[model samples]
Target: EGNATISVVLKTSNSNRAFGVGDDESKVAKLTVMVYNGEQQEAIKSAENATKVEDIKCSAGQRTLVVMANTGAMELVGKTLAEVKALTTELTAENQEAAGLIMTAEPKTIVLKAGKNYIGYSGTGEGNHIENDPLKIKRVHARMAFTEIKVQMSAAYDNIYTFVPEKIYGLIAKKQSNLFGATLVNADANYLTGSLTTFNGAYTPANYANVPWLSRNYVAPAADAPQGFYVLENDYSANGGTIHPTILCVYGKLQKNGADLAGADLAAAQAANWVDAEGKTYYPVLVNFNSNNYTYDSNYTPKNKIERNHKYDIKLTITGPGTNNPENPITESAHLNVQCTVAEWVLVGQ
Candidate 1:
């Protein structure tokens, strides 16, 4: 004699655990429900035609309620007895990034019966969720805690010169295994420069005067994580063939920041000096861009996969100031460590 009332409870997946303040603030703003004939045909087509419910402000931590009624039921239930077939539901957010999309199966399906009120779903769980209704949805977007390049110098120096990165390149990807396939979402050389000029001589030691500089703070998918290793052709050349191309290039500028004449090789105007004629105290540090120190392979592909929920620490080390000559050259070394996390990936809502 009446209609059935169905309710859904949305919760964050285990991998989608809330960290910090706004992590739990991921809320659903729109929902669409589809009612189809018992064979489950209409639920499959819900993306094309579905009843939308708006003005919803459901958060990840809790559940929200929706009441299905007579016209709502009769329009869907129809006049035929045992009329109910399958029900499908879909949802998205007003804030696109407020919550990571759940791609469980667009228009998630639920089997229904006539005149029975179905209620309570956590929207999260393990395999084949129909019996248990484990509609688990994870925040699939890869997270990069931070990207930092801490350069430490330990060389004998004459004057104060600070080393900082102008640009850095690397690759980040989802780790592939029997369960997952390798994928690159964001790939580019990350640039970090012009931030450490104020903190001049900050990383220099009292006796050695070797100036070290830490890069500006970085976040990925914005500053270039989900990043990829840069590879190139072996025959590449630049500057009208003046400088031959190498597999990898990490470019940086070193400046005096302040004038110091301790054992300084001074002349009218020369390299590695504060020029009086120019009236600028700073000078650029030139490291020889050779294949030995700055080593990479033209055939370098992304063999290292950065899986989701893993913490990767990448260190780019520059060692030099030897002989203090621009053509003589300094060396660089890079190390990367990936810390694995017990997390998995799932899709946005169905």
Candidate 2:
């Protein structure tokens, strides 16, 4: 047949629901559905603020279909699968709107039936997946959240050497990232990271404009209210045989260090222990495992990777003075207990 029509309903599953209906990250601001009839691209249809795109034109019979969501209204039909996969979305302040990160359902071959049909997916009835299974798209980025920050200074300075977190920053995030979860090759020129201004991928607030590795979100909430950031995947294979990495650090001041001079007030105490020439210090949190908790053994290998589609919930238990500088090779004196629980990205109902 020359032409056919098929409908698609986009959604996220319950288990991967990091962004719920209330959050903008879960909102389906735009939808782009592409159907391929072999090497020749068949049909591509788009809509704004809609999850279910109707009457998508394509050739019927076992065809491949993929849906990209929240990537703004742009041209895509002309692009090949490889070209589409290579398309990049640079995370910047201007890009940080309620419109969530780009998501896609890079699914497999579908037995598209030609008719006024709405393709939906449910249980494994054996006939579902290949039939009219609903397209499920997931976020292509990773989310990092912090729940607790317990200050445990040395015995002489237990709770006495307190650190006040004034802001959070995501360091070394890729300057540009693929919207379809394609791993950036190590040799690729676009596999870039780091910026002095504008955190490339940190889900920073609007006021945090043009700021990277440092910010101005001066609120430190209780354990009940945690702060999180969305960063593009910076993994070992992406950096596999390399050393570059993405990191999240807290920029704050010390209340005091040596109990003898807990100080007259917060301001005076912080000034007394401010050691970094650049001013405020950075308490960097490691990815996956807690810096102090994990014990090395025969089967142990460090997992400092930020993989796509996973959520890393980090908890910091301060045990000693924080790092004065933010750079490679964390200092020996820096003592902070960081526990990162990596989980799948919760779904955002389209």
Candidate 3:
């Protein structure tokens, strides 16, 4: 005999309509069942029978539920290849659109011009997005692209960040007209290990420093500081014409608990400082546009401060179909896919 357990949580429009006749905190819905293999549509239709079973709970209002049915086997539910393909197509379109709007159409698949920067764009619906020209890429250090499905994280930004754009950025980095002395850090090879920065549940000057500085320790590819994920058009060591461009836009915790150098991480000092609302140590991470400029010691300032001990969500969108283009660049009017990732963290004491 096979047993299936389905647990559900009900959500009511009115607080007064929340609890049922049994118990105030007993908001659990469950079910047990056998298994069936059929067409996708048929499976969906059969799923309705689960509601009719004894001990099954179906509330009148909308609710969130987890259904765990073990048939003791991974049965084919009869999802046609075409349906699966169509679903994938739809998802890809939505993800792509999000990528364009979030990164201002900067993608790894294509090349960007020099001195161009992509900023200030927004997503619409699942597969469509838009942006104004004023927020397009004007600097060459940034490039964006999608690698896989979306992920979620404790911090919103890291959850969306992917290795695809930076990987593609590698392509342009190899072809730059100027060497930029980027060879120092081995930007291309070291990308997977430490090229990107991330945020953790840390708040305090010393703790914050170490919480999110993924890009600091790596060697400089050259002096010009070649950003991750770019290719060169020609030899940039002694050339001038910027060929293929690259850009990187990352969001991570840099500073926490207001802007203070003392609140910044001191990798050299082993000093324990800072605290969060949970009575935990405070460690800050840096995202875009921070007052504390780690690149320049004097530029250390904090504009936006992220709190710790709280679950934060972040999203990274990579887009293409550059600044100059006709509307609907995607093939067959297909939309771009939307994928996200998520990560979680908590402050820990040393």
Candidate 4:
């Protein structure tokens, strides 16, 4: 039998964005560590520190140690060690929303062997707010795709009378997975383009907050007052687990000059080329999108899981006003591009 020494360090990030990281003014206000063997009678060792925990000891042989750290608040400290240990297998933001303040890292699990192991957690790294850190037990994370839809105007038409899309949305799922159960993973409802916000020249995590973890009904803008062209950056979560590819559904409505094109009206508008009584054809467009699905070739199918620190960017590009025939009408145009990026792990301080 061997004893294990474990320690946790909370690092800061420069930008307060979701996944951006750098050194900053964030600190670990509260932290808790729970130790357990495979059997699960009770937590062998548990402790909390406002600053840090260094070289905690544990008995040898296949064991799992779960750690949760919060900088700004003491939400986790109120719980008994038994309660904290019981939650080892399943812990998430839904169960602990304000787990901490502006900071780095979240619920993390570290598997111990018969020796010394070092574990580091990323912080929220926001400029002057609470922080967060991702559990580094595994190299898996959720991936997402972004599509930008644009509407161009004819030289003669006023820009204010241009086309707008409301309640833009997309959906994608894994071909098959034990982790996802029977239900397909759905992307969040994406609004058309609005003002873009960022931190340190990168997209902010607040933008991601709008990206939901489950599927829901779409909400569109009002009919009479249509706005300008917008883009939808659809994000999907594997819940930091493995996922394969399946179908991606993209659909939305067109709004122009106080009118929403849908059902019979939508078909009619497309047939008429969005024209007015004066025979002027209007052209609104959707662009830069991508879709792909997964299937197994054999009984023992391999999972095309999204790797850790990898980002899948599916782009949809739209460009045109096609033919104007009722049954064979062309409403708006769209194109697609799928791009993937290997991201560097950073602490997303809350």
Question: Residues 1-350, candidate 4, lDDT per residue (tens digit)?
Answer: 66655554444345644431211123344555555565342232233444445566665555455455442233443455355433311112221121222222233334665555445533322221111342332112233333333445444433423343323332222211111111212333212111111211111222222233222233332222221121112233334432212222233334445555446655665565543322223221111212232111223222333333233333323233322211111123322222322233443333
List lDDT for all candidates, in order.
0.26, 0.57, 0.20, 0.32
Residues 212-296 of candidate 3 have per-residue lDDT tens digits of 2222222222212322221121221213332111122222222323322232332211132212222122111122212211121
lDDT of 2 by residue, 265-321 (tens): 434534544334433556766555324553323344456666666666667777765
TM-score of every candidate: 0.34, 0.73, 0.16, 0.38
Q: Which pairs clash inside model 2?
A: 16-346, 16-347, 17-346, 17-347, 18-346, 120-134, 121-134, 236-240
- Candidate 1 has an lDDT of 0.26
Instruction: Give the 10-residue window scoring lowest on summed lDDT in candidate 2.
Output: 200-209
Quote model 2's TM-score: 0.73
Candidate achieving higher TM-score, 1 or 2:
2
Best-fitting candidate, scored by TM-score: 2
Expressed as tens digits, the lDDT of each residue in 260-290 for candidate 1 is 3233333422353322322222211211122
Model 4: lDDT to the true structure: 0.32
Q: Identify the runs in model 1 with alpha carbons over 4 angstroms from their true place.
A: 1-5, 13-18, 21-110, 117-134, 145-148, 154-161, 165-303, 306-332, 335-350
